[PDB]
Amino acid sequence: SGFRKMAFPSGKVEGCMVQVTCGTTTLNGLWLDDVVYCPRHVICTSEDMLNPNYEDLLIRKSNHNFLVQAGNVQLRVIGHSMQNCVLKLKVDTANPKTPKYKFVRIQPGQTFSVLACYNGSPSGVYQCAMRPNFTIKGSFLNGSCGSVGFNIDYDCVSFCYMHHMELPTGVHAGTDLEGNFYGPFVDRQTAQAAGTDTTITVNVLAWLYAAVINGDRWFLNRFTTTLNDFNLVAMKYNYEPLTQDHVDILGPLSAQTGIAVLDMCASLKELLQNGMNGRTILGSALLEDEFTPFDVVRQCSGVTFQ
Amino acid sequence: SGFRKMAFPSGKVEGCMVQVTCGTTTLNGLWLDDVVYCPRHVICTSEDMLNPNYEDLLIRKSNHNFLVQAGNVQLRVIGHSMQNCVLKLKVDTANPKTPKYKFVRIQPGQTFSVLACYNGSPSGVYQCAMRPNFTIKGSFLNGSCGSVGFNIDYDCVSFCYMHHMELPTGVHAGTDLEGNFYGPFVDRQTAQAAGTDTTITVNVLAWLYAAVINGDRWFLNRFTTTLNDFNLVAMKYNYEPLTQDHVDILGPLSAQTGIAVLDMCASLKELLQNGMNGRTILGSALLEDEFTPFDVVRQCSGVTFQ
Numbered sequence: 001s002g003f004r005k006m007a008f009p010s011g012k013v014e015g016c017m018v019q020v021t022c023g024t025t026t027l028n029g030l031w032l033d034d035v036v037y038c039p040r041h042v043i044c045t046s047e048d049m050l051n052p053n054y055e056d057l058l059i060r061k062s063n064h065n066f067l068v069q070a071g072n073v074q075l076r077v078i079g080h081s082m083q084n085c086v087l088k089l090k091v092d093t094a095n096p097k098t099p100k101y102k103f104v105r106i107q108p109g110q111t112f113s114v115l116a117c118y119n120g121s122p123s124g125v126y127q128c129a130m131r132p133n134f135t136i137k138g139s140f141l142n143g144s145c146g147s148v149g150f151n152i153d154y155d156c157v158s159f160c161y162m163h164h165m166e167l168p169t170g171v172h173a174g175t176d177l178e179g180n181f182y183g184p185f186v187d188r189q190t191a192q193a194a195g196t197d198t199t200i201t202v203n204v205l206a207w208l209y210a211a212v213i214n215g216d217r218w219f220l221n222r223f224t225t226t227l228n229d230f231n232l233v234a235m236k237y238n239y240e241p242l243t244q245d246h247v248d249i250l251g252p253l254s255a256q257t258g259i260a261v262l263d264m265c266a267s268l269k270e271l272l273q274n275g276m277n278g279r280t281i282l283g284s285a286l287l288e289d290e291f292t293p294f295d296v297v298r299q300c301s302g303v304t305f306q
Numbered sequence: 307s308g309f310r311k312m313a314f315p316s317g318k319v320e321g322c323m324v325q326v327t328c329g330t331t332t333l334n335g336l337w338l339d340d341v342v343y344c345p346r347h348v349i350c351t352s353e354d355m356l357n358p359n360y361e362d363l364l365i366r367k368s369n370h371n372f373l374v375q376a377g378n379v380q381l382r383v384i385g386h387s388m389q390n391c392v393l394k395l396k397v398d399t400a401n402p403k404t405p406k407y408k409f410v411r412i413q414p415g416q417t418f419s420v421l422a423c424y425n426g427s428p429s430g431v432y433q434c435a436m437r438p439n440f441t442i443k444g445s446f447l448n449g450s451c452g453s454v455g456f457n458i459d460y461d462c463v464s465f466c467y468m469h470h471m472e473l474p475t476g477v478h479a480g481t482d483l484e485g486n487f488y489g490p491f492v493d494r495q496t497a498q499a500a501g502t503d504t505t506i507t508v509n510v511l512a513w514l515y516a517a518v519i520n521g522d523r524w525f526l527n528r529f530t531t532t533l534n535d536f537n538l539v540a541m542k543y544n545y546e547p548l549t550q551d552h553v554d555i556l557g558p559l560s561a562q563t564g565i566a567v568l569d570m571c572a573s574l575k576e577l578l579q580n581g582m583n584g585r586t587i588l589g590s591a592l593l594e595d596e597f598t599p600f601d602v603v604r605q606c607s608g609v610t611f612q
């Protein structure tokens with residue numbers, strides 16, 4: 001029993017973290033097989049980030065300008081190229097600690113673990129979610145760029161996020177491992193406002209199921225609702241509209257607990273309209289939306305990873 | 307910027323996890339040098355846990371009855387002994403992945419990371435705290451016994467917790483790595499009620515400093531207080547009494563932010579007496595007490611680990 005915000009074990013990713021330095025700028029890179037992936041703004045000075053022309057800046061860089069250090073060992077760079085907003089540094093040595101891995105572009109509402117790193121060294125691991133407005137709410141100080149987000153399925157690490165930017169509002173933006181930003185953001189120090197931070201309804205419901213499974217049940221009520229009726233309430237409270245696809249994904253949790261998805265929606269409706277009256281659910285005083293239905297099933301059954 | 311509940315990178319501990327089976331019972335062990343540490347109730351049947359005589363049960367076990375598997379490899383057990391509530395299985399092979407390590411018995415209010423494991427395989431990592439009543443609020447399903455809690459200082463893993471028991475109230479009890487339970491709990495399936503779950507005042511204050519550093523400032527007020535006056539309020543709200551030792555530990559955070567410890571206490575006093583009026587601090591709608599002052603300084607400065 002008990003339910004915690006839980007990150008994936010980070011060892012497989014720790015073995016892939018390297019330091020990348022170009023000129024006066026040092027951030028983190030990801031070493032997989034014989035390629036190191038890092039944010040392209042490693043080639044920028046602080047002044048460059050106001051309006052960088054990355055293709056022109058990269059013309060002034062050669063392979064030997066990219067200093068790559070894996071712990072104490074220096075890696076030899078034998079090629080470099082830019083793919084969207086990431087650089088791919090080809091090195092002459094395959095990472096012997098390369099895990100089975102994939103690159104995946106995640107959807108808003110999906111969760112992943114972040115291994116915060118500085119100077120190529122891991123600092124901590126935590127869980128977060130791709131917000132509907134394509135930001136993440138992380139913990140990143142200067143030097144953390146190139147830290148990555150990931151999911152693990154048994155023995156395969158699916159890399160989904162590379163950190164690039166902090167918005168002036170303190171939220172975070174980054175890319176997939178193909179270098180494409182999530183959302184409209186760009187690797188330029190400019191005005192970039194985030195859209196509405198909408199709540200991930202299907203994740204709140206999954207978390208309510210997790211609560212019931214663990215004995216927090218005070219919020220269950222005698223009511224039901226419909227998708228269209230619930231969504232009128234979701235709109236009022238800046239929740240994502242619930243779809244039948246979401247209802248289907250919650251099916252296993254509905255089956256396990258015997259609480260129909262729409263009955264749980266009616267519990268959520270009352271919590272939105274009335275608040276939590278000074279009480280808590282799973283140690284939280286607000287509705288938590290960074291557990292997916294798959295996260296809940298995983299933690300409530302005890303799935304492991306090779 | 308940003309502040310997250312962050313666990314230590316778990317790779318060093320992942321390399322120490324093994325599966326231990328005795329008879330029909332399987333849990334987790336910790337393999338360090340040529341010793342495997344696990345809960346002694348691995349020798350119990352479910353029936354035994356109502357009133358086990360561990361010394362009598364262990365007389366019926368030989369070295370070959372302790373099956374120890376590190377991933378796919380079987381370890382050869384060449385000796386066994388009981389130390390308090392843990393078993394020490396001597397094996398014929400030193401763990402080649404043994405990190406620099408220490409065993410430490412932590413104090414209530416201190417935090418640590420837990421690597422939840424099943425069948426010797428890591429499942430997830432999360433942060434938690436030793437509660438003042440010597441329980442922890444974890445995420446442990448059947449099979450998770452022998453999972454460990456730990457802190458990391460640069461390259462040295464300080465192991466502080468081994469999981470043994472879930473109380474009927476759903477909280478968790480365990481031992482240090484010398485086998486001594488935290489608090490009054492015993493490895494017997496009996497009536498064991500936990501004392502008052504008191505809030506860790508010094509940690510709440512540290513977290514308020516973290517909030518200010520990150521721009522959440524609405525709760526600062528025009529007031530101050532004294533230690534004795536604040537503690538009258540702490541008592542009313544089941545908070546730990548604040549001592550001058552706590553004030554001293556918060557000194558660096560006071561110095562950095564320019565907010566005197568007792569002024570922050572007056573902010574906390576008002577939050578306790580008036581609530582949070584439907585607002586949030588660092589994404590929480592309640593006062594968070596599982597960040598230590600050292601946790602806050604670490605995450606706000608970006609310390610890493612070899």
Ligand SMILES: [Zn+2]
Pocket residue numbers: 027041143145164165
């Ligand atoms: Zn950067």
Ligand SMILES: [Zn+2]
Pocket residue numbers: 333347449451470471
């Ligand atoms: Zn057990």
